[PDB]
Amino acid sequence: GSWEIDPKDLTFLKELGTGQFGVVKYGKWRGQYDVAIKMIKEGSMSEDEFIEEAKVMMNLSHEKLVQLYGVCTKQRPIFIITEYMANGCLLNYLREMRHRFQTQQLLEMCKDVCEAMEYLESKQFLHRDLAARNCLVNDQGVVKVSDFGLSRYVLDDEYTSSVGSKFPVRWSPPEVLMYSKFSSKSDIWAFGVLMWEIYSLGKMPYERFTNSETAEHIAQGLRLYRPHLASEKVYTIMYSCWHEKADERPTFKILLSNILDVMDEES
Numbered sequence: 001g002s003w004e005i006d007p008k009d010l011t012f013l014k015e016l017g018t019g020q021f022g023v024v025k026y027g028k029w030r031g032q033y034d035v036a037i038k039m040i041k042e043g044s045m046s047e048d049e050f051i052e053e054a055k056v057m058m059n060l061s062h063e064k065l066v067q068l069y070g071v072c073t074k075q076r077p078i079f080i081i082t083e084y085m086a087n088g089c090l091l092n093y094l095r096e097m098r099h100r101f102q103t104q105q106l107l108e109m110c111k112d113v114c115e116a117m118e119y120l121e122s123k124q125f126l127h128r129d130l131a132a133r134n135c136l137v138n139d140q141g142v143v144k145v146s147d148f149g150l151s152r153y154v155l156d157d158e159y160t161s162s163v164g165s166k167f168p169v170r171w172s173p174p175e176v177l178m179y180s181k182f183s184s185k186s187d188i189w190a191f192g193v194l195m196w197e198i199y200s201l202g203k204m205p206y207e208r209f210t211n212s213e214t215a216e217h218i219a220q221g222l223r224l225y226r227p228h229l230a231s232e233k234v235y236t237i238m239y240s241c242w243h244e245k246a247d248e249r250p251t252f253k254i255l256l257s258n259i260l261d262v263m264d265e266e267s
């Protein structure tokens with residue numbers, strides 16, 4: 001179908017790194033168009049389910065969401081072909097101190113992500129693992145949301161529940177940690193943590209705690225605190241994502257309006 005790219009149309013040009021599914025490469029499609037190619041190592045993914053979901057993902061389209069161009073599934077490893085983001089993952093970009101970011105730039109990164117998440121929310125599509133490591137940066141410095149929904153297809157159980165040793169505890173609200181209750185409001189919580197990561201220039205959330213200690217901190221009702229670079233108004237926005245009661249957390253539409261208000265007031 002239209003979700004299938006012919007891998008013969010790819011020219012591989014550069015290694016981009018490795019993650020839990022294996023290697024990612026940069027190349028060209030039909031000699032002209034920049035693409036990234038994520039190669040899914042055998043045994044790592046629930047492949048038939050992912051392939052079916054890729055059809056849904058191809059219909060998503062937003063300027064701040066990494067575009068899925070297609071998949072290559074006639075051979076193994078299968079390929080995911082996407083828009084190319086030359087500046088890599090947001091986490092590592094934030095940690096490069098040479099950039100000497102202004103706080104207006106940091107707030108713009110938050111706004112980029114919030115726009116993508118408002119779009120996903122309008123499509124009833126949960127990210128399920130939003131974090132700076134899962135956002136990408138293009139050659140213009142624009143941040144886009146990536147790997148959306150992908151955690152649903154991971155076969156390594158260390159990633160798939162809080163009983164696992166590689167679960168995103170530090171991005172999880174109390175109802176996820178205690179009950180596995182995912183919702184729009186668990187994406188909201190994670191977005192607040194992501195804002196904290198941005199304003200902390202890529203520090204690990206709860207940097208001095210283990211995952212187990214973090215879950216206890218959350219069970220006691222405690223929270224991250226204000227990054228040095230966040231104004232009081234910015235801190236209010238990120239902190240609003242962490243209400244104990246999920247229903248008291250904002251929507252992405254509300255967060256976007258709040259971010260724009262602050263951008264105007266701090267311009």
Ligand SMILES: *CCC(=O)N1CCC([C@@H]2CCNc3c(C(N)=O)c(-c4ccc(Oc5ccccc5)cc4)nn32)CC1
Nearest residue numbers: 016017024036038082083084085088089091133147148
């Ligand atoms: C900090 C995290 C980290 O070290 N890595 C994750 C990003 C990896 C590289 C970096 C360079 N660019 C890039 C791209 C890209 N599109 O340019 C990708 C990538 C990410 C996701 C997908 O496939 C999907 C997209 C959207 C939804 C579902 C799947 C393809 C390609 N990865 N990188 C380096 C390591």
